[PDB]
Design a protein around this ligand. Sequence first.
Ligand SMILES: Nc1ncnc2c1ncn2[C@@H]1O[C@H](COP(=O)(O)OP(=O)(O)O)[C@@H](O)[C@H]1O
Lengths: 109, 322, 322, 322, 250, 250, 199
Amino acid sequence: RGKLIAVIGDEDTVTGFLLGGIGELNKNRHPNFLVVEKDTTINEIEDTFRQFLNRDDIGIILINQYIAEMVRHALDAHQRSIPAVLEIPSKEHPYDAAKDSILRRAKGM
Amino acid sequence: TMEVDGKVESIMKRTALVANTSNMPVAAREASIYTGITLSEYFRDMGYHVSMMADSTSRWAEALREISGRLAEMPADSGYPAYLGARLASFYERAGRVKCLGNPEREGSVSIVGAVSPPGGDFSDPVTSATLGIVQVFWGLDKKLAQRKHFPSVNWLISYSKYMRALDEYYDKHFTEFVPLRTKAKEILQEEEDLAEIVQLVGKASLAETDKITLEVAKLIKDDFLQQNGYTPYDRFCPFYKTVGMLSNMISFYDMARRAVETTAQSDNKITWSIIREHMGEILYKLSSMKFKDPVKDGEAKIKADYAQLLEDMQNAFRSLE
Amino acid sequence: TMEVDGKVESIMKRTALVANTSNMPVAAREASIYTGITLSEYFRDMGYHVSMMADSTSRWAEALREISGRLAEMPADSGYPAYLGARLASFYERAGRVKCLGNPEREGSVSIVGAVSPPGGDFSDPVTSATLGIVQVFWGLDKKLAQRKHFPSVNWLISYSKYMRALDEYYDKHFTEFVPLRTKAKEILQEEEDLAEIVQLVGKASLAETDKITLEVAKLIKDDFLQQNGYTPYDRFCPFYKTVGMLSNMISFYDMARRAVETTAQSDNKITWSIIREHMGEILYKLSSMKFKDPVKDGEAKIKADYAQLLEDMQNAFRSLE
Amino acid sequence: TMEVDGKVESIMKRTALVANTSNMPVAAREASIYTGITLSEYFRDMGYHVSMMADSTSRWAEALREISGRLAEMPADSGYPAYLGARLASFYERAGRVKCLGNPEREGSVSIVGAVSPPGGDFSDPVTSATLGIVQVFWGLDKKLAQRKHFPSVNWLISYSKYMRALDEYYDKHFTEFVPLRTKAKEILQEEEDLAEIVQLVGKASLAETDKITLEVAKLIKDDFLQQNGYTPYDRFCPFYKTVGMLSNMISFYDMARRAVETTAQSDNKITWSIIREHMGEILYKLSSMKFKDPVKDGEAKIKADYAQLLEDMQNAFRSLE
Amino acid sequence: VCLFLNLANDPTIERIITPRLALTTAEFLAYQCEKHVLVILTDMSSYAEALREVSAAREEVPGRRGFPGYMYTDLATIYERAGRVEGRNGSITQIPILTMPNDDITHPIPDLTGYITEGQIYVDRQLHNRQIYPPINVLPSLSRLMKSAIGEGMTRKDHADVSNQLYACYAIGKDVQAMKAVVGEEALTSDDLLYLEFLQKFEKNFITQGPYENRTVYETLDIGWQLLRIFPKEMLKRIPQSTLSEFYPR
Amino acid sequence: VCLFLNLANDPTIERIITPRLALTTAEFLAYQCEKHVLVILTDMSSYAEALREVSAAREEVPGRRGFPGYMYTDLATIYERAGRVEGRNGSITQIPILTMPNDDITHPIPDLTGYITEGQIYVDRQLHNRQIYPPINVLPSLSRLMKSAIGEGMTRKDHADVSNQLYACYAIGKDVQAMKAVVGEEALTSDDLLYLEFLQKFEKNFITQGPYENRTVYETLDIGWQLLRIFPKEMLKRIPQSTLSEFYPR
Amino acid sequence: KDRIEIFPSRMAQTIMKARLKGAQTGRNLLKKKSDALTLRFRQILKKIIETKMLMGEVMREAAFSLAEAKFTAGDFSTTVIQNVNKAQVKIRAKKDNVAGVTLPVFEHYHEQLAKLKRNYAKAVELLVELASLQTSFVTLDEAIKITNRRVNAIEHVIIPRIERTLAYIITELDEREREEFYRLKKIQEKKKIIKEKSE
Ligand SMILES: Nc1ncnc2c1ncn2[C@@H]1O[C@H](COP(=O)(O)OP(=O)(O)O)[C@@H](O)[C@H]1O
C-alpha cells in the first residue's frame, strides 16, 4: 500500500540505489528501475518514464541530470506534484542548479 | 521671528491675519478669502510680493454652501451652490504677478497657497476637485510620511508643479544645471517606486546592480535630500544654491556609479553596488552629511567649495576603482 | 382563553380592541393610537398593568404625513412632518410604571409595544429613526433569518434592550444565576458572528478547538434556544424558569467543553471538538430536545429535575472523558 | 432605389420627412411627432404599411418639460410633467395594424419605431421607463458595444421582442428551420454570459470543454453574426435568407463541435476545442467571413449554394477529425 | 453638577434652548467664577431633530439629508462656546454625545460635529455585544489635543509614550487575530502570541472598567505599563529608552 | 483669427453671449463672406455653468445635476450653427473644448454635448499621466461624419476597414489588459500576447505624436497597417479579404 | 459590468457599503493567506537549493564508494540488479498544513560493500526529504497562484464594481433630494402667490 521509489540512471546508480533497498517486482513482476545502456534510445526512456508516472504506487522518481535533459519534454509536461521527480548527479555528467524541471517555478533563486 | 539686516524682527511686522473661528457670522467666513485677497492685492499694488494662505478653503466653501442654503438656492453637485467652481476660479485668478497700476514703475505679485481639506483623503469632492483643477501646484502633505518621521511630509509622488516650464528660463539663467538634476532625481524616485513591487515579488537579491544603485541613491535622496529638519540651525532654511549643490553631488554619484556598473558589465571583474559601497563608504557618508553645512557660518563660497571638493573626491575614488 | 384561578376564561374579559382598517378616514387612523393609549392609561390608573400593542406606528406616521401634506406644511426628510419625532415621543412616553393618582395607594403601568414596518426593511426610515430615539427596547428584524424560516426572526446583533440594568435587581434576587448566562450567551453569539465571516471567506480548516466549541455551541443556542415555534403546544409560551434552565445547561456545556479542550491542550491526551461530539452525541441530542419540555404537563418541578439530570449527565460524561 | 416590376425607382418616392432639428423651436417638436403620426395614419388608411421613425422621443419629452416649466406646473420624476406617460402611451397606441375605414376592404399598418435618448445612458430615465411600458419591442443599445464598434450595438441580453410568439406562425411556414436556430442562438448567448461572469473572476483554466465551445461559438455569433457594418455594400442590407443561413451554419458548427466533444469525452482520443480550432482554422474563418457575401453582387442562389458548401466542408472536416 | 433635563416629550423649542442655557451657565461659571467647567451635551442628534422641527415651523425648505442648511452654523454656535480665555483661570471643556443614525459617520450631524470639534470617542457595537464596558473603540477614536493634555507637570512623563505604544500594540494585536484566523494558532510565532495576549488583557483590564470604577490617570498609566510589560523592552519600539529604563522595571 | 475672451474674473452671465457673438461672426464670415471658419468655443463647461446659474436665479425646471431642463436646446442652439450650406462656398467647423467634471463622460454637460454634436475627441487622463501626447483615447471618441468623409476618392479606400480593425484590436487589447490584471501573465494565450503587443505599439506609434508633427492621412493609414500586420490575416475579421489581399502583404 | 444594478436607495447604499467592507476584509484575509503561503514557499525554495547542494556531495561520496567497492568486490552490479526481490525501503504518504492548504510529504520507512550500502541509504535519506520538499513546493506554488488570482480578482473586479455602485447611488440620492427641493420650492412660491392673491 505504501509508495515505492523509482530510478532511471546508469547501471552504477541503479546498483547503488538497489543496495539502498529501493527495487521490487510487483504482482506483474514489473520493475521500478531502469539501466540506461547505450543500447537504449530516447523513446525507450520516455516510455518507461511514462509507465513510472502513470503507475499509482511509484511515489518518488529519480533521474540522472543528463537523462532528464534527454527526456526533458516529458519532465516539463508532468506538472502534478505527487509523483515527485528528482534530478540527481552522475559520474558521467555533473549536476547543475540551472535547468531543473522543478526549479522552473522559482525566479528568486 | 525672521532675521532681516542681521536683526531678529518679528514676522508680524510684515504679516496680517484675517482670523475667524467657526461660530463667527457665516458672511464673515465666506468673505474671509475675499478680504485676504484684497489686502494682498493692496500690498501687491504697492510693489511688494505678497503670499496669501487660506488655511482651509473647505471651510470657506462650507460657509458658501450655508449661505446658499439660507438663500434657498438650488443645490448643485453634492449640496454646494451653483457657482462654487466659478467662485474658486475667480478667487484664484486674483493671484499672479502684475505691473502695478500707477506712475512709479512697479511690479508686485500675490501668491495664493490656499489649503484644502479632502474628506478622508478623497480628492474627489467638489471643493478639492475645483481647487486641484484651478491651482497649478500641489504640495501634497502626507500623514503617512509624518508617522515615518519624514519631515517635510511632502509625499513627492502625488505632489506636482506646473510652473517648471515657466521657471525653465530662470533656472537656465541662474542655475543652468538644476533642470536636468531635478529631472534625474524625479526619474530616480519613480524608478524606486516601481522597483518597490519587484522587491516584494523577487526580493532584493534578484535586483540588478543598476537597480541596486537606483534604490540606494533613491534612499539617499529621500533621507538626506528631501528629508529636512526645520529646527536645526544648519538646514532650517536651505538656500537654493545649497539645494542645487547637494542634488548635483547626489546625481553625480548616481551617474558615475551607473557608468562604472555598465562599463564593467563586460569584464570578468564586474563591479557591484556592494563593491562601490565598500570602497566609498566615506564618500557616501559625506553625501549624507552635505546637509550639515550651515549657510550662515559656512558662506555660499565655502559651501560651494566644499561641495566641489566632495565632487573631486568622488571623481578620484571612481577613477581609481574603475 | 387563559387559565385564571383554575378556570379557563375568555381573553376578551381583560382585552379591548381599537380596530382601524387602512381604508378608514386618515384622521381616525391618526387618533386611533391616542384612543388606545388613553384607554391603557385609564386602566393603569386603576392599579392594573396594561399591555398596549400599536399594530403599526408606521401607518400612523403615514397618516401624519398625509395630513401634513393636506395642510401644506413643509416636510422633513422623506416627506414626513418635522414634528413626527415629537408625536412619537408624546405617544411612547405615556408608557411607564406609575404611582397612580388617587388616595388609595396603587401602582399601575402601561407597556407600549409599537410595531414599525419601514419601506423595504429600511433602517433609516424616518419613523424608525424617530422610534429608536425614544423606545428603550428594539427587537430588530433579520431578513436572513426570516428567509431561512428561523422564528422568532429577531436579529440579536442590532436589537437591544436598555432595561437590563434595571432588571439586574430582579434577576439577582429571583434568577441569581441568569445574568452571567446571558452575558456568556451574548459573547458566544458575537464570537460566532465574527468566526462565520472567516469560515466562509477563507475556510474551516484553520479553526482552533475553542473556535469549534464556540461555533457549535452557537449553533446549538441559535437552533434550540433562540428558535421557538409558537404554534406548538410545548413552545407557545416558554416560562422564564424554562428559559433560564435551558440557557444554564447550554452555557454549562460551553464552559465545561472549553475547559476540557483548553486543559488538554499542550498535553499528550489532547481533546478536540470531534472527540466530544462523537463521545456524547446523546448529550447534544438531549440539549437539543430540552426545548420540547411542555410546562402544561411537564410541571415546573419536573422540568427543573430533568434539566438537573441533563447537567448531571454532562458532568459525568466529561468526567469520564477527563 | 428599389425594384418595382423590374424597374428601379427611388425610395424617396415613398419617404416623407418631417424635420424639426434640435435648434428649431422647442414647442414645435411635439407638433412634429403628431404631424408625423398623422401622415402615417393617412397612408395607413389607403392600405399601405407605413413605418414612422420617431428620431428621438426624448427630445419631445424634453420639449414638454420646458413648456411645463414655463407654465410653472408641478413636475413628475426628474422634472417631466405628470402627463408624460399618458402622452407617450396615446402616441404609441396609434401604431397597430388596422382594417382601414371605408367601403373598399383594405389593411394598413403604422409601425412606430421610436428612438429614445436616455440622459447619461441610464435606462431608468423617466422617458425610457415610460416608453418601455408601452412599446412591445425593446432594442436597447449598449454604449460599451458601440465603443468597440460592435454595430448594431443592440444589447442581446436586455433587449426583447413580444412578437415572437405571434411570428412563429409565419416563420414555421416561410423559414421553417429558423425558430429552433433562434432558440439555440439565444441559449448559446445566455450560457456564454454566465460563463463570462465566471471567467472574469476564475479564468478559463477550469472551464469544461463544452463550456469553451459555448464561449467560442458565442464569440463567433457576436463578432460575425450579430454585429453588421451598415456602411458596406454587403452588410447594409442582410436579407432574411442570409440572416437564417448564417445562423444555421454557426448553430450547425456548434452542434457538431458539441457532439464530437461529448461523445469522445470517455474515449482516449479526447477531442477538445484546441484540436477543433487547429484542424478547422479554414472553416472557422469561412464562418467568420460568411457575413461578407454580397446580396446584390452575389445572387441569392449563389449565397445559399456557398453556405451549403460551407456546411458540407464542416461536415467532411468533422468526419475526418472524428 | 448642574443638570438640565429635556425629556423626549417636553417641547422641542425647549430642546433648542436647553444647550444654550447649559452653555450660558458654563460661561458664567468658567469666565466669571473662574472654575474649570465640563459641559456634557447628550444626544446632539435629538437637538438636531428639534432644530429641524423649528426650521420646518419657519417654513424653510429642508437642506442636506432633510436638515437645515445652517445646521453647521448652529452646531458651531453651540460647540464653540468653549476653551480657555486670556486673563481668566476658568475654562469650558465640551463632550457632545451623538447617536450616529444608521451607524453612518457621513450623516450630517456627526459630519458637521467632526468638522467643528477636535476629536471623537467611538462607542463600538462590537465591543458592546462582546459585553465590554465602556465599549470605547480606541482605534477609530482620536483626541487632536491629547499632546497638550499630557506630559510632565500635567499628567506624567511617560503618558505620551505609553499611549502610543498601547495603540500600536493594540493595532498589531487585532492584525495578529486576523492572521491567526487564517493561519492557525500553531503557525503563529512567539511575538504573535504575545500580541494576542496583550490584546486580550488590554480589552479585559484597560478598556473593561465597570461603571463605578474611577481610575486616576496615574492608575490608568500603571495599568498600561502592566500591559506593556507583557512584551520585552525591545518590542516596545515606540517608547524611548529613556522612559523604558525608568518605568518598565517592576 | 478673431478672439472673444471672457476670462475667469469677467462677468458670469456675459458668457451666455460670448459663444453666440463668436458664432454670429463666423456665420457672417462663412455664409456671407464665403470663408472657411473654424470656431473654437473654449470651456463650454463654463458656459453651461453660467446657464445653470441663470436658470437657478429664474427657478427654471432643472434637469440632471441641477442644470436647466432646456440645456440640451441651448447647447444645440450653440452647436447647430455649423456645417456647409447650399449655394454658398463657406463653412463653419466647430470644435468646442469642454472639461468633463470629475472625468465623468456621463455628466450632463459632456453627455448633452455628445447628444448634440457630431462626435467627440476624448482626452484621457490615463494616457496623459503616462505622458502620451495627444492623450486621445480613441475608444470613447467618435466622428459621425467619418463614414462619408473617407473611402475611395477622398483619402484612401482602406481607411474605413483599417479604422474599424484598429478599433476592434484596441478594444480587445484593453480587454486582455483587464483580464491580465486578474489572471497574471502566465495565463495569457499567444493571441492575448499578440493583442497586448498591438496595444503597446498602437499607443506608442499611432496615438503618440509630436506636438508639431503633421502626419498625412496616408502616413496615419500606413502606421495603422504596420500595426495591424502584427496579427495574421485570419485575426483581422473586420477587413474583407479583398482589402487584406491588396494592402496586408506590403 | 460597471454596476451591481441595485436600485438607488438608502437601504441599497447601506447594503453596498456593507458589501464593500466585507469584500475588503476578505481581500485582506486572502492577502494574509497569500503572504503566509509565499513565506513558506520561499523557505521551501531555499531549503530545496540547500538540499540540492548537499546532494551534490552525498551522491558524489556514494558514487566514489561504489567505485571503491567495485575495486574489490568486482562486477557486483549484475548480481545486485538481478537480485531485487522486494523493496527494503519504502515511502509512506503524510500530510502537512500551511494556512488552509494541505501539502503532501513523504515518510522514509523500512520493510567496502557495507560502506556502499550505508552511503546509498544516507543518499536515500536525503532524497526522500528532497522529494517531500519538492512536492510541498509544487503544492504551495499552485495554492499561491490560486490565492493571488482570488485577491487580484477581488481588488480589480469586485471592489471597483461596488465602489462604482456606491458612487452612482450617492449621485441618484442627490438627484432625489434635488427634485424634492425643487418641488418644495415651487410649492412655497405658489403658497406665497396665493397669499398675495388673498391680500
Ligand atoms: N449599422 C451600423 N454600421 C456601421 N456604423 C454604425 C451603425 N450604426 C451606428 N454606427 C456608427 O455609430 C455612430 C453614431 O450613429 P448615430 O446613430 O447617428 O448616433 P446616435 O446614437 O446619437 O443616433 C455613427 O458615426 C456610425 O458610424
